[PDB]
Scaffold this active site. Structure first.
Site, PDB file in Angstrom:
ATOM      1  N   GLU A  65       1.550   0.011  -4.947  1.00  0.00           N
ATOM      2  CA  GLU A  65       1.091   1.266  -5.528  1.00  0.00           C
ATOM      3  C   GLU A  65       2.228   2.264  -5.531  1.00  0.00           C
ATOM      4  O   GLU A  65       2.573   2.813  -4.476  1.00  0.00           O
ATOM      5  CB  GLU A  65      -0.002   1.895  -4.675  1.00  0.00           C
ATOM      6  CG  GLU A  65      -1.302   1.147  -4.527  1.00  0.00           C
ATOM      7  CD  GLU A  65      -2.211   1.908  -3.575  1.00  0.00           C
ATOM      8  OE1 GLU A  65      -1.875   1.958  -2.371  1.00  0.00           O
ATOM      9  OE2 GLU A  65      -3.224   2.497  -4.032  1.00  0.00           O
ATOM     10  N   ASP A  88       0.849  -1.184   0.000  1.00  0.00           N
ATOM     11  CA  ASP A  88       0.000   0.000   0.000  1.00  0.00           C
ATOM     12  C   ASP A  88       0.892   1.244   0.000  1.00  0.00           C
ATOM     13  O   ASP A  88       1.837   1.328   0.791  1.00  0.00           O
ATOM     14  CB  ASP A  88      -0.877  -0.022   1.254  1.00  0.00           C
ATOM     15  CG  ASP A  88      -1.926   1.059   1.258  1.00  0.00           C
ATOM     16  OD1 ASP A  88      -2.859   0.983   0.432  1.00  0.00           O
ATOM     17  OD2 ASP A  88      -1.828   1.968   2.118  1.00  0.00           O
TER      18      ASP A  88
HETATM   19  O1  LIG Z   1      -5.681   8.156   1.222  1.00  0.00           O
HETATM   20  C1  LIG Z   1      -7.047   8.498   1.284  1.00  0.00           C
HETATM   21  C2  LIG Z   1      -7.693   8.231  -0.077  1.00  0.00           C
HETATM   22  O2  LIG Z   1      -7.490   6.869  -0.413  1.00  0.00           O
HETATM   23  C3  LIG Z   1      -8.126   6.414  -1.598  1.00  0.00           C
HETATM   24  O3  LIG Z   1      -7.568   7.034  -2.770  1.00  0.00           O
HETATM   25  C4  LIG Z   1      -6.758   6.171  -3.559  1.00  0.00           C
HETATM   26  C5  LIG Z   1      -7.397   6.027  -4.929  1.00  0.00           C
HETATM   27  O4  LIG Z   1      -8.608   5.323  -4.769  1.00  0.00           O
HETATM   28  C6  LIG Z   1      -6.476   5.263  -5.870  1.00  0.00           C
HETATM   29  O5  LIG Z   1      -7.004   5.261  -7.176  1.00  0.00           O
HETATM   30  C7  LIG Z   1      -5.094   5.890  -5.898  1.00  0.00           C
HETATM   31  O6  LIG Z   1      -5.199   7.170  -6.540  1.00  0.00           O
HETATM   32  C8  LIG Z   1      -4.155   7.382  -7.458  1.00  0.00           C
HETATM   33  C9  LIG Z   1      -4.692   7.147  -8.860  1.00  0.00           C
HETATM   34  O7  LIG Z   1      -5.144   5.807  -8.999  1.00  0.00           O
HETATM   35  C10 LIG Z   1      -3.567   7.439  -9.842  1.00  0.00           C
HETATM   36  O8  LIG Z   1      -4.054   7.334 -11.164  1.00  0.00           O
HETATM   37  C11 LIG Z   1      -3.055   8.851  -9.624  1.00  0.00           C
HETATM   38  O9  LIG Z   1      -4.132   9.694 -10.045  1.00  0.00           O
HETATM   39  C12 LIG Z   1      -3.727  11.007 -10.341  1.00  0.00           C
HETATM   40  C13 LIG Z   1      -3.451  11.080 -11.838  1.00  0.00           C
HETATM   41  O10 LIG Z   1      -2.269  10.389 -12.196  1.00  0.00           O
HETATM   42  C14 LIG Z   1      -3.302  12.523 -12.287  1.00  0.00           C
HETATM   43  O11 LIG Z   1      -3.304  12.540 -13.697  1.00  0.00           O
HETATM   44  C15 LIG Z   1      -4.426  13.418 -11.763  1.00  0.00           C
HETATM   45  O12 LIG Z   1      -5.590  13.317 -12.570  1.00  0.00           O
HETATM   46  O13 LIG Z   1      -4.653  13.266 -10.373  1.00  0.00           O
HETATM   47  C16 LIG Z   1      -4.892  11.931  -9.964  1.00  0.00           C
HETATM   48  C17 LIG Z   1      -5.192  11.978  -8.473  1.00  0.00           C
HETATM   49  O14 LIG Z   1      -4.470  13.028  -7.871  1.00  0.00           O
HETATM   50  O15 LIG Z   1      -2.657   9.083  -8.283  1.00  0.00           O
HETATM   51  C18 LIG Z   1      -3.634   8.805  -7.300  1.00  0.00           C
HETATM   52  C19 LIG Z   1      -2.988   9.006  -5.937  1.00  0.00           C
HETATM   53  O16 LIG Z   1      -2.573  10.342  -5.833  1.00  0.00           O
HETATM   54  O17 LIG Z   1      -4.559   5.999  -4.596  1.00  0.00           O
HETATM   55  C20 LIG Z   1      -5.348   6.742  -3.685  1.00  0.00           C
HETATM   56  C21 LIG Z   1      -4.641   6.744  -2.333  1.00  0.00           C
HETATM   57  O18 LIG Z   1      -4.448   8.078  -1.945  1.00  0.00           O
HETATM   58  C22 LIG Z   1      -9.635   6.676  -1.545  1.00  0.00           C
HETATM   59  O19 LIG Z   1     -10.256   6.298  -2.756  1.00  0.00           O
HETATM   60  C23 LIG Z   1      -9.944   8.135  -1.261  1.00  0.00           C
HETATM   61  O20 LIG Z   1     -11.335   8.262  -1.030  1.00  0.00           O
HETATM   62  C24 LIG Z   1      -9.171   8.612  -0.034  1.00  0.00           C
HETATM   63  O21 LIG Z   1      -9.257  10.017   0.056  1.00  0.00           O
END
Ligand SMILES: OC[C@H]1O[C@H](O[C@H]2[C@H](O)[C@@H](O)[C@@H](O[C@H]3[C@H](O)[C@@H](O)[C@@H](O[C@H]4[C@H](O)[C@@H](O)[C@@H](O)O[C@@H]4CO)O[C@@H]3CO)O[C@@H]2CO)[C@H](O)[C@@H](O)[C@@H]1O
Ligand SMILES: OC[C@H]1O[C@H](O[C@H]2[C@H](O)[C@@H](O)[C@@H](O[C@H]3[C@H](O)[C@@H](O)[C@@H](O[C@H]4[C@H](O)[C@@H](O)[C@@H](O)O[C@@H]4CO)O[C@@H]3CO)O[C@@H]2CO)[C@H](O)[C@@H](O)[C@@H]1O
Ligand SMILES: OC[C@H]1O[C@H](O[C@H]2[C@H](O)[C@@H](O)[C@@H](O[C@H]3[C@H](O)[C@@H](O)[C@@H](O)O[C@@H]3CO)O[C@@H]2CO)[C@H](O)[C@@H](O)[C@@H]1O
Ligand SMILES: [Ca+2]
Length: 854
Positions: free
Chosen positions: A486, A449
């Site tokens: 991840e 994680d």
């Molecule tokens: O930590 C609390 C949060 O946890 C959970 O969030 C998860 C997401 O569900 C996952 O999908 C992942 O998020 C990634 C994402 O998958 C990945 O693609 C990337 O996304 C960026 C993207 O590259 C960029 O182009 C732009 O559009 O912004 C996106 C998001 O900023 O990075 C994401 C992580 O930063 O991991 C997170 C863990 O943080 C949960 O769903 C949330 O409700 C909760 O807040």
């Protein structure tokens, strides 16, 4: 409080000031100091070892601590530095590592005639151990520990075995500005009483904690020839059996449910395993907060009551949310103690059952042909500070195990209480924990994680230590243990600010997998945090607009998918949609990063769905035109899962992908109970239309959800669910029918994998992937496949039949794959090849696999 200065080595303090003195008070009385020490500027500056370990303070001024200072005494005090008036606290991890890094035994060590306990607590003023007889009984005895170099220890008689205990730790807590007596569990605990209230002084090697034939498990492990043969199925322990009526009521929801060999759930896993599934990834199964280990304390809403509420009502979630803090349910990403199995999943939360039953689960899964992957959560802690059952690490050495900002405040970007794996004893605990699970529980792999929050050096040391375990010395073949995680790069760890971290780009060339978010987003459309209605390659972009340039957008996504299907390699060359030949790394995402970033297919975890965000079924139901039938959407579900199952690299499936699993469109179901997370192994329902999901994470999207959840035409019947399962299992069978789908190196992929529908005039909605094997005497390559000399996969997302003429593949002996010739799906059986023109005809919304037999 405010701590802007850093004590980085025994003799050096770093502080970003443009005379400086150090003050110490053992009683936390600060005037009030017991010591005052003038610090001289160090003209030699900060050493390279300091700047490498703490890059973010490389610009800070260095101040020498005189060598006559008793540093070991001062680190136990309330400390401040003052400039001449600016005053601030000191962050101690650097000096604590420099002086007190410890690699000796921690926790309990059992010898023939004794038991020793060791606790690392270099800032503590005193440590005692409080023994209890029994998990619930009163204290029996307190014994003082003795300190040497920051480690507190005591040796007692062998009769101490199986007592319960806690540590009484007197230590300064900055958050309270007091020296507090804290009652703490053992960071190196191997068992606990209910809820980790006490630590059980158990010998993890005790023979009565081992199931029958445990020591022969290595001989019974499923064959794994190569990491390129891995497929992963991600499953929550409670989800697995909470609703399974074929498991006795008392064993539903926990480790014991895996011992029911002929249950609906286990028959389901056997079906997947027999088709070729290799690994099951279990959601957090160590000691986490948020679920009471004592089952009789659980509150559940009546499911029969909830089933009376309307399908688009907000009443179900209101009921669930009202008791969600006291129910049996959480994903478990709330770490307290990493090295102990979760008590709520055991039959009895006090003592041995959690150990034995965890081992029985691993054994059971191995014996039905599945290796076990643990979801490990080393990036943050549930709690910090001196109070409460849920704080352990930060209770004992405050401000050390957690990462802090340049003002001394705890970092919370992971969720809360980010850990600092860059610190020596955090790194040690992480790797020691991994070896515990690998050796004591014979776990076959680990999913990290927020691996981006972990230092790369920790990841690589863990990989080395795990991979060198042997059956002769340790009872497990370490060479088969697979690591992935991840690799998201964000917040305080982004751009290597805290050191080289475990981000996607940094883990290229390490043999450690990372989730490929590029293929996920290209297939589904948009991003989990973008517009919910944004369409992708498999959700109707251009071809079937939902009504809430697009030809080129579709082609851009097809390019990204193709790089992914070829293992998401940095150096794989593709004819892009503009016609230009581009390396995987030269094709960019919408945020400017390379699409392809790996050095090997084993570094790519290809997925379209996971526990996070909307399920595959739900995302398809949101993004596709409302007018589509559920029959059409089922075919779309199959297409997405098939793109994973027939990709190079490592396919990752969310439990329920294969049976149209819904969460009623819940995008983050971690605390949404059994109601929204239902896995139904009767196949009667997929859990679509069970109310609007919890408002906390979903309320802004309720208006789009309600009409869909209420519309009966969105809900699949048992027939659809069984059709999905049968076709899912068929595509798995196809992957394991030929080693050509599972090439082990980037060289093999570059030599053998070609895409045949590319360039500016590509046919929209179709991907054609060919994979070559040796043919004829003296070939250019090795023969990997004894049955087939060539494979071609056609993914057609168009709602109509397509005919793809490929001259390169004309005049060959292609036939439909025997599994698909033999399919229950009427449409795929109609697929055909014509040699005269190399024409592949594929029905609408179908994936067809063609083989050239030997
Ligand atoms: O930590 C609390 C949060 O946890 C959970 O969030 C998860 C997401 O569900 C996952 O999908 C992942 O998020 C990634 C994402 O998958 C990945 O693609 C990337 O996304 C960026 C993207 O590259 C960029 O182009 C732009 O559009 O912004 C996106 C998001 O900023 O990075 C994401 C992580 O930063 O991991 C997170 C863990 O943080 C949960 O769903 C949330 O409700 C909760 O807040
Ligand atoms: O039921 C009567 C049979 O009992 C005995 O065979 C059992 C085994 O003891 C079980 O352990 C199990 O083994 C199967 C397993 O279920 C099956 O999935 C497959 O395992 C593969 C795995 O799926 C795959 O991913 C790959 O990597 O490697 C594994 C093999 O190493 O094959 C196993 C059998 O080899 O079930 C069987 C029954 O099928 C007994 O030996 C039999 O004589 C008897 O009929
Ligand atoms: O409760 C106080 C706590 O609230 C905040 O943390 C919460 C997160 O905002 C919330 O999303 C949730 O985090 C979980 C993810 O949703 C889930 O997908 C998965 O990754 O597990 C996470 C942890 O369980 O819950 C936390 C905790 O309530 C806030 O950020 C904290 O600082 C604050 O302490
Ligand atoms: Ca809960």
């Amino acid at each position: 409080p405010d701590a802007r200065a850093y004590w980085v080595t025994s003799d050096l303090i770093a502080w970003n000031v443009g005379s400086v003195c150090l003050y110490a008070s053992r009683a936390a009385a600060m005037q009030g100091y017991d010591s005052k020490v003038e610090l001289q500027p160090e003209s030699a500056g900060l050493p390279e070892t300091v700047t490498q370990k703490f890059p973010f303070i490389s610009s800070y001024r260095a101040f020498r601590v005189p060598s006559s200072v008793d540093v070991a005494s001062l680190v136990k005090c309330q400390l401040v530095v003052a400039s001449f008036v600016d005053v601030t606290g000191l962050q101690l991890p650097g000096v604590l590592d420099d002086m007190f890094a410890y690699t000796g035994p921690l926790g309990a060590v059992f010898s023939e005639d004794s038991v020793s306990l060791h606790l690392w607590a270099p800032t503590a003023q005193g440590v005692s151990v409080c023994f209890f007889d029994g998990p619930a009984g009163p204290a029996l005895e307190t014994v003082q520990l003795k300190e040497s170099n920051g480690v507190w220890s005591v040796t007692g008689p062998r009769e101490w075995e199986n007592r319960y205990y806690l540590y009484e730790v007197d230590v300064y807590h900055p958050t309270k500005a007091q020296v507090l007596k804290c009652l703490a569990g053992d960071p190196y605990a191997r068992s606990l009483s209910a809820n980790g209230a006490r630590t059980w002084l158990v010998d993890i090697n005790n023979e009565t904690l081992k199931p029958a034939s445990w020591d022969e498990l290595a001989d019974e492990k499923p064959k794994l020839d190569s990491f390129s043969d891995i497929t992963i199925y991600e499953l929550h322990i409670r989800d697995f059996s909470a609703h399974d009526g074929t498991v006795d009521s008392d064993s539903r929801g926990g480790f014991r449910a895996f011992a029911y060999q002929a249950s609906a759930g286990m028959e389901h896993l056997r079906k997947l395993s027999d088709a070729g599934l290799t690994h099951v990834h279990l959601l957090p199964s160590f000691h986490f907060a948020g679920v009471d280990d004592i089952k009789s304390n659980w509150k559940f809403v009546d499911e029969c009551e909830l089933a009376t509420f309307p399908p688009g009502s907000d009443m179900q979630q209101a009921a669930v949310v009202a008791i969600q803090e006291e129910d049996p349910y959480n994903w478990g990403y709330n770490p307290v103690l990493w090295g102990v199995p979760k008590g709520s999943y055991a039959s009895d939360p006090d003592g041995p059952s959690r150990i034995i039953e965890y081992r029985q689960m691993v054994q059971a899964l191995n014996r039905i042909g599945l290796r076990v992957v643990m979801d490990v959560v080393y990036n943050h802690l549930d709690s910090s500070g001196p109070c409460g059952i849920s704080s352990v690490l930060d209770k004992i050495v405050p401000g050390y195990y957690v990462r802090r900002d340049t003002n001394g405040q705890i970092e919370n970007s992971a969720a809360m209480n980010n850990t600092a794996s860059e610190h020596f004893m955090v790194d040690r605990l992480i790797v020691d924990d991994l070896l515990n699970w690998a050796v004591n529980y014979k776990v076959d792999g680990f999913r990290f994680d927020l691996m981006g929050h972990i230092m790369k050096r920790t990841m690589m040391r863990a990989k080395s230590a795990l991979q060198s375990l042997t059956t002769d010395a340790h009872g497990v073949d370490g060479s088969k243990i697979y690591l992935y995680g991840e690799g998201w790069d964000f917040a305080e760890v982004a751009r290597n600010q805290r050191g080289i971290n475990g981000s996607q780009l940094n883990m290229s060339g390490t043999g450690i997998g990372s989730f490929n978010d590029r293929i996920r987003d290209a297939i589904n459309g948009g991003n989990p945090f973008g517009n919910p209605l944004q369409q992708g390659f498999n959700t109707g972009l251009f071809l079937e607009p939902n009504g809430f340039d697009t030809r080129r957008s579709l082609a851009t996504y097809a390019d990204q998918i193709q790089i992914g299907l070829a293992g998401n390699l940095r150096d794989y060359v593709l004819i892009s949609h503009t016609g230009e030949a581009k390396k995987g790394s030269e094709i960019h995402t919408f945020d400017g990063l390379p699409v392809g970033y790996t050095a090997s297919p084993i570094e790519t975890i290809n997925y379209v769905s996971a526990h996070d965000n909307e399920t595959l079924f739900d995302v398809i139901s949101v993004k596709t035109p409302m007018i589509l039938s559920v029959d059409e959407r089922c075919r779309i579900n199959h297409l997405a899962s098939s793109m994973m199952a027939l990709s190079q690299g490592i396919p990752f499936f969310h439990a329920g992908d294969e049976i149209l699993r819904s969460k009623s469109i819940d995008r983050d179901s971690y605390n949404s109970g059994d109601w929204f997370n239902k896995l139904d192994f009767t196949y009667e329902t997929n859990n679509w239309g069970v109310g609007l999901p919890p408002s906390e994470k979903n309320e802004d999207n309720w208006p789009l959800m309600k009409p869909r959840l209420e519309n009966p035409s969105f809900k699949p019947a048992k027939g659809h669910i069984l059709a999905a399962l049968d076709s899912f299992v068929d595509i798995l069978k196809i992957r394991y029918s030929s080693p050509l789908f599972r090439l082990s190196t980037a060289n093999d992929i570059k030599q053998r994998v070609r895409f045949h529908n590319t360039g500016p005039s590509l046919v929209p909605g179709v991907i054609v992937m060919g994979i070559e094997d040796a043919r004829g005497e003296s070939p250019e390559m090795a023969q990997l496949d004894t049955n087939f000399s060539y494979v071609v996969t056609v993914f057609n997302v168009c709602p109509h039949e397509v005919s793809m003429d490929i001259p390169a593949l004309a005049s060959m002996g292609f036939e439909l794959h025997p599994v698909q010739v033999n399919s229950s799906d009427t449409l795929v059986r109609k697929s055909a090849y014509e040699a005269a023109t190399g024409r592949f005809t594929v029905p609408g919304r179908t994936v067809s696999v063609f083989v050239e037999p030997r």
